[PDB]
Amino acid sequence: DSKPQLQRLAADADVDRMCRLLEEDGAFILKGLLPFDVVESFNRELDVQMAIPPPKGERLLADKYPPHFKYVPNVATTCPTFRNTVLINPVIHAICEAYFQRTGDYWLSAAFLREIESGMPAQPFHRDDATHPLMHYQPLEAPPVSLSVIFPLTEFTEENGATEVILGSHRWTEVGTPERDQAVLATMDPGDVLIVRQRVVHAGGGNRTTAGKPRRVVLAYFNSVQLTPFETYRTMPREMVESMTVLGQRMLGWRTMKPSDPNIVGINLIDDKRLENVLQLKAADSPAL
Amino acid sequence: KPQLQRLAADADVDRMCRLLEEDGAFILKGLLPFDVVESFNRELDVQMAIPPPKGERLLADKYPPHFKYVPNVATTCPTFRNTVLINPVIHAICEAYFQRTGDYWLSAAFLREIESGMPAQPFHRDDATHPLMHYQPLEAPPVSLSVIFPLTEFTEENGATEVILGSHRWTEVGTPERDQAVLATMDPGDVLIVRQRVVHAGGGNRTTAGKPRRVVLAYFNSVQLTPFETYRTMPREMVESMTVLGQRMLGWRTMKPSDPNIVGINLIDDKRLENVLQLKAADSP
Numbered sequence: 305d306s307k308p309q310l311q312r313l314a315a316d317a318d319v320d321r322m323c324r325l326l327e328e329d330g331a332f333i334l335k336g337l338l339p340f341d342v343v344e345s346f347n348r349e350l351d352v353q354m355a356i357p358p359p360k361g362e363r364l365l366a367d368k369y370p371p372h373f374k375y376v377p378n379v380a381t382t383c384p385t386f387r388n389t390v391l392i393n394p395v396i397h398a399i400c401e402a403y404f405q406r407t408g409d410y411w412l413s414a415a416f417l418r419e420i421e422s423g424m425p426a427q428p429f430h431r432d433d434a435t436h437p438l439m440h441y442q443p444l445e446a447p448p449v450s451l452s453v454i455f456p457l458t459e460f461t462e463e464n465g466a467t468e469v470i471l472g473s474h475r476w477t478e479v480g481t482p483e484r485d486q487a488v489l490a491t492m493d494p495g496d497v498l499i500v501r502q503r504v505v506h507a508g509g510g511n512r513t514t515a516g517k518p519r520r521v522v523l524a525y526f527n528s529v530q531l532t533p534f535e536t537y538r539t540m541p542r543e544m545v546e547s548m549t550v551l552g553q554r555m556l557g558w559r560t561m562k563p564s565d566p567n568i569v570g571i572n573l574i575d576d577k578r579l580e581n582v583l584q585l586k587a588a589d590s591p592a593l
Numbered sequence: 594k595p596q597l598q599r600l601a602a603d604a605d606v607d608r609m610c611r612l613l614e615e616d617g618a619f620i621l622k623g624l625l626p627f628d629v630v631e632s633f634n635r636e637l638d639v640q641m642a643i644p645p646p647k648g649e650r651l652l653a654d655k656y657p658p659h660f661k662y663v664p665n666v667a668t669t670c671p672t673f674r675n676t677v678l679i680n681p682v683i684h685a686i687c688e689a690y691f692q693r694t695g696d697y698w699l700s701a702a703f704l705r706e707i708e709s710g711m712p713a714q715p716f717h718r719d720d721a722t723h724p725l726m727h728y729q730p731l732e733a734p735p736v737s738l739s740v741i742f743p744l745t746e747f748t749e750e751n752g753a754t755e756v757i758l759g760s761h762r763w764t765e766v767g768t769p770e771r772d773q774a775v776l777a778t779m780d781p782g783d784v785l786i787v788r789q790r791v792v793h794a795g796g797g798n799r800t801t802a803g804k805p806r807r808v809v810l811a812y813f814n815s816v817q818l819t820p821f822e823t824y825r826t827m828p829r830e831m832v833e834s835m836t837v838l839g840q841r842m843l844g845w846r847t848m849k850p851s852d853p854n855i856v857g858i859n860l861i862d863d864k865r866l867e868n869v870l871q872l873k874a875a876d877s878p
C-alpha cells in the first residue's frame with residue numbers, strides 16, 4: 305500500500321526500537337511470538353468456555369447484547385495456556401517495562417475474547433479510554449498508563465476485518481471522524497501480536513467474509529497499577545494462584561505493587577505490609593528467586 | 594483575611610459544593626457525636642498499644658521511629674467501619690463532588706499522631722500516591738477528595754492543618770508563605786474537607802504539654818484509581834456485618850465509573866463481584 309505500514313518484528317527484536325515505534329507510529333506487530341501449538345491449545349480452552357450454555361443470572365456486558373454475541377471474560381481464570389504461557393511472555397513484559405518506565409508498575413486490567421462472525425460491520429474509530437474515563441483528560445506528554453495488546457487467534461485479513469490502525473494518531477487532539485483509508489491493516493497470522501499505544505486511534509475491522517469462519521481476537525489491557533483492574537482475579541482459588549509465577553501473581557493483582565515516585569511506599573497493600581506477605585502467598589518460581 | 598467557612602452538619606450540600614469549587618475546602622462543625630469520637634479514640638488507643646512489629650513496614654520504615662501511625666483503621670476500629678465510614682453527610686458531599694467521575698471508594702483511612710516539638714509539613718498537593726493526578730487538567734473531573742478527622746482539638750499552638758484557599762486554581766504549588774494559609778482549628782467531631790489540587794500542610798506542634806495532635810485521614814477516590822489500602826483480606830463475617838455502602842467503600846463490590854464506561858469496574862466472570870461472592874450485607878434486601 306502507498307501509505308507507510310505497520311512494522312512487523314521478530315520476537316527477538318530490539319526493545320529501544322519497539323519503544324520508539326510506539327512513540328512515532330503508535331503501534332507495531334510482533335511476528336510469531338506464540339507457537340502454533342500454544343495458539344491452538346488456547347483456542348480449545350476458549351472453545352470450552354463458549355460451549356457453556358448461557359447462565360441463569362445477570363451478565364453485565366452480555367445482557368446488553370443479542371444472544372448470538374460471543375464473549376469470554378477474564379480468560380486467565382479459565383484458560384491455563386493464557387495464565388501460564390501467554391500472560392508472562394518475556395517479550396511482552398520487556399516492552400511493558402520500557403513503556404511504563406515513567407509511570408512505574410503495571411498489571412493486567414482485562415483479558416477477554418471477542419469473536420466477530422460474518423456479516424458484522426466495522427467498529428467506529430475510537431481511543432481505548434472508556435474503561436477508565438480519566439484517561440480521556442490525560443495529556444499526551446504525561447506518563448502513559450495503559451497499553452493495548454491484541455492477540456489474533458484466527459487469521460487477520462483484509463476480508464475478515466483485520467484491526468485498523470491510524471499511525472501517529474495519538475498526536476491528534478480528538479478522534480473526530482477519520483475516513484477508513486487513513487488507517488492501515490494489522491493483517492496477522494495466529495501467534496502474531498499487535499501492540500497499540502495509548503491514544504492511538506483504531507477500530508475493529510468487521511467481518512465481510514461469507515464462508516462462515518468468524519474472526520477471533522483476545523484483547524489484553526495492561527495498565528499502570530494506579531488504575532483499578534476492570535477484571536478482579538481475587539476470587540481465584542489459592543491453589544491456582546500459588547501455581548502461577550510471581551510475575552503471574554503480580555499481573556493478576558495478588559501482590560503489592562509500586563507506582564513510580566513520588567509514590568515511595570507503593571500500592572495495593574494492607575497493615576503496612578505487602579499483600580503477599582499478609583496472605584503468605586507461595587509461588588511456583590519463588591525458590592529460584 | 595478570608596477564613597475557612599464553618600458549616601453546621603445539617604447544612605445544605607449545594608453550599609458545601611460551591612465552597613469546594615470556590616475556596617477549595619470547608620469545615621463541618623460537630624459531625625461526629627461525642628460517643629463516636631471517644632469510642633473511635635479508644636479503638637485507636639488499643640491499636641497503638643501493640644508493640645512495634647518485627648517484619649517489614651512499608652511506610653513506617655521510611656520515617657523516624659517517633660513517627661506515630663496506624664494503617665487501614667477500618668479493619669481494626671469498628672467505630673470507623675460501622676459509623677464514620679458511612680456517614681450520610683460525608684457521602685452527600687462525595688456524590689456531589691464525584692458526579693462527573695462517577696463512583697468513588699476509599700483509598701486509605703489511617704491515623705497520624707504529631708507529637709510536641711515537631712516542625713510543620715511542607716506545603717503540598719495530595720497527589721503523590723497516584724502520580725497520574727499530577728497531569729490531570731484543572732477542569733477535568735476530580736478523582737480524589739481528602740477528608741480530615743481531628744480526634745484531638747486542632748489549635749494554633751498544636752499545629753492545626755494549614756490550608757491555602759483557592760490554591761487549587763494554581764498551576765504549581767510553588768513556594769507559598771505560611772501566612773498565605775488559614776488554620777483548620779477544630780474540635781473533635783468536626784471534619785475538614787479538602788478539594789483535589791488544594792495546597793496545604795500539617796501544622797507542626799508548637800506545644801510542650803505532651804498531648805500529641807491526633808488526626809485520621811480518609812482519602813476517597815474515583816473507583817478508577819487503585820485503592821492504596823486493600824481490604825480484600827477482611828474476614829467474610831466482618832465484611833457481611835457491614836452495610837452495602839461500607840462494602841462498596843472497601844472494594845468488595847462492583848462499581849461504576851461515569852459514562853462512557855457502561856459496564857462498570859472491579860467485576861469478574863461478567864458478574865458483580867458481590868454476586869459471585871454471594872455477599873450478604875447488614876442492610877441488603
Ligand SMILES: O=C(O)CCC(=O)C(=O)O
Nearest residue numbers: 432466467507508509521
Ligand atoms: O476488534 C478489534 O480488532 C479491535 C477491538 C477494539 O479495539 C476494542 O474493542 O476496543
Ligand SMILES: O=C(O)CCC(=O)C(=O)O
Nearest residue numbers: 719753754794795796808
Ligand atoms: O496533618 C495534617 O493535618 C494534614 C496532613 C496532610 O495533609 C498529609 O499528610 O498529606
Ligand SMILES: [Co+2]
Nearest residue numbers: 770771772773
Ligand atoms: Co508573608
Ligand SMILES: [Fe+2]
Nearest residue numbers: 430431432506
Ligand atoms: Fe479498542
Ligand SMILES: [Fe+2]
Nearest residue numbers: 717718719793
Ligand atoms: Fe496532605
